[PDB]
Design an enzyme around this catalytic site. Structure first.
Site, PDB file in Angstrom:
ATOM      1  N   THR G   1      91.216 -22.376  35.249  1.00 55.84           N
ATOM      2  CA  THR G   1      90.155 -21.445  35.755  1.00 55.84           C
ATOM      3  C   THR G   1      89.489 -20.721  34.574  1.00 55.84           C
ATOM      4  O   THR G   1      90.197 -20.367  33.600  1.00 55.84           O
ATOM      5  CB  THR G   1      90.719 -20.427  36.753  1.00 55.84           C
ATOM      6  OG1 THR G   1      91.162 -21.127  37.912  1.00 55.84           O
ATOM      7  CG2 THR G   1      89.711 -19.386  37.184  1.00 55.84           C
ATOM      8  N   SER G   2      88.179 -20.502  34.673  1.00 59.27           N
ATOM      9  CA  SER G   2      87.383 -19.713  33.707  1.00 59.27           C
ATOM     10  C   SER G   2      86.459 -18.793  34.502  1.00 59.27           C
ATOM     11  O   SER G   2      85.679 -19.314  35.316  1.00 59.27           O
ATOM     12  CB  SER G   2      86.622 -20.618  32.765  1.00 59.27           C
ATOM     13  OG  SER G   2      87.484 -21.591  32.194  1.00 59.27           O
TER      14      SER G   2
END
Ligand SMILES: *C(=O)[C@H]1NC[C@@](C)(O)[C@](O)([C@H](CC2CCCCC2)NC(=O)[C@H](Cc2ccc(OC)cc2)NC(=O)[C@H](CCO)NC(=O)CN2CCOCC2)O[C@@H]1C
Ligand SMILES: *C(=O)[C@H]1NC[C@@](C)(O)[C@](O)([C@H](CC2CCCCC2)NC(=O)[C@H](Cc2ccc(OC)cc2)NC(=O)[C@H](CCO)NC(=O)CN2CCOCC2)O[C@@H]1C
Ligand SMILES: [Cl-]
Ligand SMILES: [Mg+2]
Ligand SMILES: [Mg+2]
Ligand SMILES: [Mg+2]
Ligand SMILES: [Mg+2]
Lengths: 225, 233, 211, 222, 204, 195, 196, 196, 195
Positions: G1-2
């Site tokens: 995830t970013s």
């Protein structure tokens, strides 16, 4: 191998009919597309009793809720109640679920994991056959599929599972939920695995088995004068 | 006993009427970090064999060398090195399958799964698998890592048994492979867009295509997905 | 379940015929007595491969001895080659419990227990295996020095049947041997399937069972 | 850790008739829930009218069949082309297996052929080289499903003459090759229904004085 | 240590033409030690038959539990429970102990007294219902029973034929299991008749 | 804790129970009665963990004695065995189970029949012609398979128990310091004082 | 995830990739990681999907009941409820939440709640597995009082580097713009951001 | 540790921080992590300081004996020596080495050997604990055929950022410039690079 | 097995060694002699791991017996004990140590003196007036610390040993099936047949 995808004016669910115990087949014709409400269905993967119990529990409560509110039950309600209950048990109810249906808000498709995570999607697959199915769905799914298209794609996704996954097998169950129509449940939609005729009959000559004693069992209530 | 460090993901391949196709992406992964964006994992041996390697890149680089040293050794006192006594795909596979199984039995394996694709002296297709345990198997379609799970289903829809191989052209087969690589790019978090593909055909020989790219990628439906259940905005 | 005892009329040997893989019954027709020479018997219990191999290998070594020394091997010397062999492997996980039973002029009828932790004992009565306790119970309660050959055979048989019944990991059939001055004599395979019912009826034993 | 072993599933079945023997195997090769091949042969002609399958970890099974085939090649060389009898083969394999007693071959081995009286013979081996001659043996994943059936059908176990109260057993007979193949096929249909590692194909190698014949039957592919 | 294989035992149930059969072994042991050669695993409430394999203390407990519930049921409903309904009660009752299960393999057999329709089912230890048309298997020789059933079985067998089939399924599967055998019982069940037969099998 | 036997003959049940209480390295007592009279015609022998054994037996004894006062009636052996099995069957899913195995030997005054019930700490009940808990069975069940008949007299049952006691003294590693023996019959519970 | 949030002149922008992974398998490639707890208070989710959904749900419930009684809650108040849950259940939660919202008084505000259940008020925030790769980039390239178009570019560039290097990130870049104007959802496909 | 090498028009530059840690203790704040294996073949070391010193010492030996016999070795041959050692002893070693050298024929080359013992020829290379934090920055700011002044700056900015975020990194930035001109040693102090 | 005792009196040494050989659940033999004659006036009793005991006893025996032929002479008990000690002390740092404890009882014909040596598997040697290995010591030592006198006769040695066996047959959990008793004096080694 369980899957669901949306089409033009509805949502469709597909599932194989195999249940396993370690490496043996316990069941060749089990129904993985569980009833929640008349137009809300739930595909079950994971621990079999857990998937069966959690869909029956939420389905029972959705019925009491529908009665209480005098309304058609919504998919987002089944979604919330499954997800809050699985979350409470921290994965120990090992149920992996694809929820789909029609309600007054339109048509819906959701996945639910054992720990209580939910996903939204136009096409979803779950269980040991999910990668076989997702390869077919990722090759052939487009927007505004017709129903004839939708049923072909869903049944092709479950077949990918049946052939290529040892965890999945036997027959394809399908359930169609179109807007403003009765949901149609198509158990044994495909039957691509009928056992071939045996070489021999193993029916024994009567008296083959050695018997020590006989007796009549009394199954009736009160033998009477 | 080690653990793989830099790794290469799926190698996929299939037999068609005349030859064999084999493809592999150009990524060297360092766990989750997408470290090396230029790694070639299809290594041709002569003009009749391509060896496709997945697993640890250091153990792949060693196998590369073994194969390069094999060509050299095969030339030694062999006037027929570029003809009847040239290396066969079956000779190269059997060498690797020997090495792989001896390294597992010394409890120091080469952390790889290997598809040998090629065409023999007599024009017969050759496709065989070997991994770090020295397990071997042949099939009209073969895949490693994610490709076993996702590519094989797709490629078996085209060649489901032996009698399907003569009905499959190089256009049908390549299209199946290029599609499967796109699937793998959607659904493998340790894959890349940039891949290489080799056809080995009994007439046109060894075609080796570099810097291919997954395209016709369908993302549009994304704009409509909002939240994880009840969210409308 | 294997036993071997000494009596007035020589040695009696009796074994069952079952092989297992945990609770999987692998066979009901296995031989557990190797005929080393006309005067020397080996019994087998434990690792199927460990027993078959090393007792076959013991036969080889018993043959080389009689080639080199122009003399049949003593039961002492034979038992001590197997016991010295397994003692070299001690800790490596061999699983063997075995009785070397034979007649020589110098020793008379002799029985040596040998097991994979390196124990070697001479004695008149041994029972070896998962079923040994069941066998001991019947054998010790009917045993005298001066049974008839006929009676001693029956007891050795009946002791294995006892163990075949109660022990989940024993059964199939009873193989019977009798060792004399003149050498060993086979006294037949007796399938438990048929032997249990004959013994029940004729002896009026096994009153635990719906007959 | 590195685990040097794996499980390629599959199932094998030897049956010894009066003047013939069969050795059958499914052609399916798996790891975990993936199918590797639908046709990977597992039952080999080794020469001298001996057929052999080493079912389990396919790598160890290949190693062993490859070492036994070589054993046969050297027994010709070293003993003036003398035929390696099945009993002699059986003993040779025991030594092959037991050589690795402390790092075994993860296989169950059946060989079949003719003894030196021309009579059908099946021999059967645990992973570290214990062996027995039998009329009947199934090996591998579905052995536990098949062996009870063979006990019943080939050796007529638990079957008595009707009207004898239960005191005359059904007398033992040699089955015809036609009859044996029906049992083999019915055993592999049955196993395939209930074991997720058995299916795709059935290959049977038949051994008579005349040589080694093959038969191939489709099995369900799910 | 594994509760499902301390005592041993097998149950097998088959449907026939207007009949069902349920059969069990008689062994109870403590692993290698055989103890009782009279331990029956088939119980009946009215005309509904329940075989139970697994941990013997749970076999006994659940019988006492289903006699209790089926007695009350009858007192309120004023009728004997039916196989379809009893099956759901078993599943409910197993799943209520989800995180502390009974270590059993139940098998329901019987004929619906209204419809005349033969019915068998089996369960995992936490209540998942398998409602087979052909046959159900349970116990330490389940693999052996699956193999025997899947080959020997054919649909619409008469009462006296199904007796021969089911007996041969159990007897040959028990003989390849160390923890099963020591005698066996077969129930042949018709709509208004029930025969019970003790089989002469090998005592090892 | 390492030997309790029972044998049901024609007209009585005979319970035979070792006298040794051992802790680690030392035999603490050689005259221990591993038994409680539950009712005049029902005797329960016991063997298992230390404390647990007597604490269980004395709890069961109280309960049956309370029942006998309340109804002014003696429960059938079959009833007392069922009560006991259920207490152990309840106990095995407890925080700390009773680790106790028991034989129950009773004379049912209604059916004029001796009855022997073997129950282990899990709640596993069986009615038997002869029974044993622990390692004893491994020797004594084969003996009794050979030498038992169901029409044996009480003296014949005592002769049959000597063989079981001889065979255990011959082949069992521990010194259990002999057995106290009790006969349950239509006249109640008596101890054979020479054995 | 970013995931990130950046305050600019007119309000705040939330950014996230769309990749959800079960090991190396992408379970969902079009995940919406930008979740509404109120009309103009949104959060970015990272950690256990189950855990952060259960948390955002409870927080949405609490802020809805808040609004019924006391009216529109401050961004701070949304952060405080997230914190309360995260901190007090730290022994059973794997949640790393960025909270971002718009008042007319306070304007744009970003809070980050890392695995501690601590709270930090920041001009911008990055989190998720992909964030490690873009600390360098984001520290060098962030300015205060950027325009809307500058802030869309900064996030598109930043998440683009995060997606390139993190195998756990990927898919489309979703953003949510939060100003007096209201609530604008944005999407940017790979064929735009990859070639930056 | 934060270490990088970059090829530019006139050859190659190696840069490193100076911080050696035992847990959270800085055992040495002025480490020289730039180590000579030949006149114009240097490496940057990361991992076990024992293991990489043993390796660099053995390679310095192999290239000295090579020069005696066959004249000046190529940067490729140094990389191969570093690889042969690292690959073959991979179970008893924790070495992340970057190799950089200048020929007149091949000009600037950079090879990186990560843990397993693989070799990778690259225009530039970054490594060590601090490298995770600049993958984004370096990728966005690297150009081929930069001038010496540009490459000093690219390296100084990049390590400046790795130092800011990584506790395992810090101290002074050491640079070694490898051109036709010879070997130039540059140091940069916190009071210069921190305020970038 | 388990119990080996030794008592050194005026003019003899007496070894007492248990006759049981037990493996798991069965007593396999009840007439086992746990002793090898090393030389005409030197006896070693041994106990410990199965296999190791006899292999180490017969190993020491052949080595002493070899020395006796090579020098046509009998090594002192002190010389035999020091040789044995060094074999164990070498063994303890092997790949697989001999798990064997021994008593050596000898009559030194040069000093006209009986000698008892106690050696454990680590190679721990001590000269003692009385010795024991394993659990025996925990009882028999305090008993001898009370009843022992250095000037006792052999008939008084034997009585003092009967006291040790009676106590061991009272307070030890495992039936060791009696002891075989052997006297080492100036005339050599003999076995007391009725004990
Ligand atoms: C497609 O992907 C299918 N793949 C097949 C399969 C079997 O994995 C499954 O998930 C299927 C789910 C269906 C079965 C039909 C009823 C509705 C649910 N699951 C099973 O068949 C399940 C296997 C399983 C066992 C254990 C665990 O976690 C440890 C996960 C899955 N079988 C069972 O649960 C059997 C049923 C017995 O008849 N029983 C047990 O496993 C008993 N143990 C359960 C775990 O706790 C201990 C007791 O279908 C997907 C969709
Ligand atoms: C009387 O007490 C009998 N009790 C039955 C039994 C089965 O325990 C046994 O000991 C029997 C011995 C005969 C010897 C002559 C050849 C036939 C067997 N033993 C076995 O059948 C043996 C059990 C066993 C397994 C494992 C170990 O140690 C780990 C000890 C004993 N069976 C096997 O070994 C099976 C045979 C399968 O066909 N194979 C394996 O267990 C394979 N593993 C062996 C160990 O290494 C790994 C592979 O007979 C006595 C007399
Ligand atoms: Cl999510
Ligand atoms: Mg199958
Ligand atoms: Mg049996
Ligand atoms: Mg038995
Ligand atoms: Mg990515």
């Amino acid at each position: 191998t369980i899957a669901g995808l949306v089409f033009q004016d509805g949502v469709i669910l597909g599932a194989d009919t195999r249940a396993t115990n370690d490496s043996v087949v316990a069941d060749k014709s089990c129904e993985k597309i569980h009833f929640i409400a008349p137009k809300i269905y739930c595909c079950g993967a994971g621990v079999a009793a857990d998937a069966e119990a959690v869909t029956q529990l939420i389905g029972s409560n959705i019925e009491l809720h529908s009665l209480y509110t005098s309304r058609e039950p919504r998919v987002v309600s089944a979604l919330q109640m499954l997800k809050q209950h699985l979350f409470k048990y921290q994965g120990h109810i090992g149920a992996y679920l694809i929820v789909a249906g029609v309600d007054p808000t339109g048509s819906h498709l959701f996945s639910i994991h054992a720990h209580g995570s939910t996903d939204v999607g136009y096409y979803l697959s779950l269980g040991s056959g999910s990668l076989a199915a997702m390869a077919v769905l990722e090759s052939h799914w487009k927007q505004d599929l017709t129903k004839e298209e939708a049923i072909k794609l869903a049944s092709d996704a479950i077949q990918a599972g049946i052939w290529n996954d040892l965890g999945s097998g036997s027959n394809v169950d399908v359930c169609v939920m179109e807007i403003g129509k009765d949901a149609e449940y198509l158990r044994n939609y495909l039957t691509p695995n009928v056992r071939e005729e045996k070489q021999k009959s193993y029916k024994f000559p009567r008296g083959t088995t050695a018997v020590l004693k006989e007796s009549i069992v009394n199954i009736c209530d009160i033998q009477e004068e | 006993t080690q653990q793989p460090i830099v790794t290469g993901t799926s190698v996929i391949s299939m037999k068609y009427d005349n030859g064999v196709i084999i493809a592999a992406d150009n990524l060297g992964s360092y766990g989750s970090l997408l470290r090396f964006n230029g790694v070639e994992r299809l290594i041709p041996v002569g003009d009749n064999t391509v060896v496709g390697i997945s697993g640890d890149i250091s153990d792949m680089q060693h196998i590369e060398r073994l194969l390069k040293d094999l060509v050299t050794e095969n030339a030694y006192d062999n006037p027929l090195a570029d003809a009847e006594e040239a290396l066969e795909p079956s000779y190269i596979f059997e060498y690797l399958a020997t090495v792989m199984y001896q390294r597992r039995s010394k409890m120091n394996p080469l952390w790889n799964a290997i598809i040998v694709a090629g065409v023999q002296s007599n024009g017969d297709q050759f496709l065989r698998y070997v991994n770090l345990l020295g397990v071997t198997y042949s099939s009209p379609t073969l895949a490693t890592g994610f490709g076993a799970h996702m590519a094989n289903p797709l490629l078996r829809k085209v060649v489901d048994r032996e009698s399907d191989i003569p009905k499959t052209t190089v256009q049908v087969a390549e299209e199946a492979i290029v599609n499967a690589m796109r699937v793998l790019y959607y659904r493998d978090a340790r894959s890349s867009r940039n891949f290489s593909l080799a056809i080995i055909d009994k007439n046109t020989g060894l075609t080796f295509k570099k810097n291919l790219q997954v395209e016709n990628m369908k993302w549009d439906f994304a704009k409509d997905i909002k939240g994880y259940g009840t969210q409308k905005i | 379940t294997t036993l071997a005892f000494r009596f007035q009329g020589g040695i009696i040997v009796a074994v069952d015929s079952r092989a297992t893989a945990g609770n999987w019954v692998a066979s009901q027709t296995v031989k557990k007595v190797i005929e080393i020479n006309p005067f020397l018997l080996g019994t087998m219990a434990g690792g199927a491969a460990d027993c078959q191999f090393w007792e076959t290998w013991l036969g080889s070594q018993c043959r080389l001895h009689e080639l080199r020394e122009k003399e049949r091997i003593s039961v002492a010397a034979a038992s001590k080659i197997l016991s010295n062999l397994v003692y070299q492997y001690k800790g490596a996980g061999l699983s063997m419990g075995t009785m070397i039973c034979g007649y020589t002029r110098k020793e008379g009828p002799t029985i040596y227990y040998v097991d994979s932790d390196g124990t070697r004992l001479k004695g008149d009565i041994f029972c070896v295996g998962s079923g040994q306790t069941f066998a001991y119970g019947v054998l010790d309660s009917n045993y005298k020095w001066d049974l008839s050959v006929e009676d001693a055979l029956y007891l050795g048989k009946r002791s294995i049947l006892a163990a075949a019944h109660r022990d989940a990991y024993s059964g199939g059939s009873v193989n019977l041997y009798h060792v004399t001055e003149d050498g060993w004599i086979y006294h037949g395979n007796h399938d438990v399937g048929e032997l249990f019912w004959k013994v029940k009826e004729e002896e009026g034993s096994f009153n635990n069972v719906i007959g | 850790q590195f685990n040097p072993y794996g499980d390629n599933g599959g199932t094998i079945l030897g049956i010894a008739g009066e003047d013939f023997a069969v050795l059958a195997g499914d052609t399916r090769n798996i790891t975990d829930y993936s199918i590797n091949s639908r046709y990977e042969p597992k039952v080999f002609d080794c020469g001298d009218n001996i057929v052999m399958s080493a079912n389990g970890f396919a790598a160890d099974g290949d190693a062993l069949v490859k070492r036994f085939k070589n054993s046969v090649k050297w027994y010709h060389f070293d003993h003036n082309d003398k035929k390696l009898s099945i009993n002699s083969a059986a003993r040779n394999i025991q030594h092959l297996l037991y050589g690795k007693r402390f790092f075994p071959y993860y296989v169950h081995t059946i060989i079949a052929g003719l003894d030196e009286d021309g009579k059908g013979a099946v021999y059967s081996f645990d992973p570290v080289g214990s062996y027995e001659r039998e009329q009947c043996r199934a090996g591998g994943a579905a052995a536990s499903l098949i062996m009870p059936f063979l006990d019943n059908q080939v050796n007529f176990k638990n079957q008595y003459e009707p009207g004898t109260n239960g005191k005359v057993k059904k007398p033992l007979k040699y089955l015809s090759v036609e009859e044996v193949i029906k049992l083999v096929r019915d055993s592999f249909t049955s196993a395939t229904e209930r074991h997720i590692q058995v299916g795709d194909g059935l290959e049977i190698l038949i051994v008579t004085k005349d040589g080694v014949r093959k038969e191939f039957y489709e099995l369900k592919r799910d | 240590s594994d509760p499902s294989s301390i005592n041993g035992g097998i149950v097998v149930a088959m449907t026939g033409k207007d009949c069902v059969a349920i059969a069990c072994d008689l062994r109870l042991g403590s692993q290698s030690l055989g103890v009782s050669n009279k331990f029956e695993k088939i119980f009946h409430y009215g005309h509904v038959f329940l075989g139970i394999t697994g941990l013997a203390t749970d076999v006994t407990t659940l019988n006492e539990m289903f006699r209790y519930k089926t007695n009350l049921y009858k007192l309120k409903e004023e009728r004997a429970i039916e196989p379809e309904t009893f099956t759901q009660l078993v599943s409910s009752s197993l799943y209520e102990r989800r995180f502390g299960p009974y270590f059993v393999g139940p098998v329901v057999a019987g004929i619906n007294s209204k419809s005349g329709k033969p019915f068998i089912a089996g369960f995992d230890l936490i209540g998942c219902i398998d409602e087979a048309k052909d046959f159900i298997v349970s116990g330490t020789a389940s693999d052996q029973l699956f193999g025997m059933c899947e080959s020997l079985y054919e649909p619409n067998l008469e009462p006296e034929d199904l007796f021969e089939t089911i007996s041969q399924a159990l007897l040959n599967a028990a003989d390849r299991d160390a923890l099963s055998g020591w005698g066996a019982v077969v129930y042949i069940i018709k709509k208004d008749e029930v025969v019970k037969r003790y089989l002469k099998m090998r005592q090892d | 804790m390492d030997i309790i036997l029972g044998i049901r003959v024609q007209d009585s049940v005979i319970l035979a129970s070792s006298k040794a209480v051992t802790r680690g390295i030392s035999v603490l007592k050689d005259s221990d009665d591993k038994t409680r009279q539950l009712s005049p015609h029902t005797l329960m022998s016991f063997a298992g963990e230390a404390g647990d054994t007597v604490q269980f037996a004395e709890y069961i004894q109280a309960n049956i004695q309370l029942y006998s006062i309340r109804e002014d009636y003696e429960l059938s052996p079959q009833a007392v065995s069922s009560f006991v099995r259920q207490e152990l069957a309840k106990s095995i899913r407890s925080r700390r189970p009773y680790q106790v195995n028991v034989l129950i030997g009773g004379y049912d005054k209604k059916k004029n029949k001796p009855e022997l019930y073997q129950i282990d700490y899990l709640g596993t009940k069986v009615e038997l012609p002869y029974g044993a808990h622990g390692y004893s069975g491994f020797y004594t069940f084969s003996l009794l398979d050979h030498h038992y008949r169901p029409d044996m007299t009480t003296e014949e049952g005592l002769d049959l128990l000597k063989l079981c006691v001889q065979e255990l003294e011959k082949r069992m590693p521990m010194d259990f310091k002999g057995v106290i023996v009790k006969i349950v019959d239509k006249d109640g519970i008596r101890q054979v004082d020479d054995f | 995830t970013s995931i990130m949030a950046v305050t600019f002149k007119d309000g705040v922008i939330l950014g996230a990739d769309s990749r959800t992974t079960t090991g190396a398998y992408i379970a969902n490639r079009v995940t919406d990681k930008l979740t509404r707890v109120h009309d103009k208070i949104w959060c970015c989710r990272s950690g256990s999907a189950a855990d952060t959904q259960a948390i955002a749900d409870i927080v949405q419930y609490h802020l809805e009941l808040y609004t019924s009684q006391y009216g529109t809650p401050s961004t701070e108040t949304a952060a405080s409820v997230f914190k309360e849950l995260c901190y007090e259940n730290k022994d059973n939660l794997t949640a790393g939440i960025i909270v971002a919202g718009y008042d007319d008084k306070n304007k744009g505000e970003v809070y980050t709640i890392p695995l501690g259940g601590s709270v930090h008020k920041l001009p911008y925030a990055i989190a998720g597995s992909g964030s490690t790769f873009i600390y360098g980039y984001c520290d060098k390239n962030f300015r205060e009082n950027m325009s809307k178009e500058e802030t869309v570019d900064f996030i598109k560039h930043s998440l683009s580097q995060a997606i390139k290097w993190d195998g756990s990130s990927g898919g489309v870049i979703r953003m949510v713009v939060l100003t007096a104007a209201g609530v604008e959802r944005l999407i940017f496909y790979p064929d735009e951001y990859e070639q930056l």
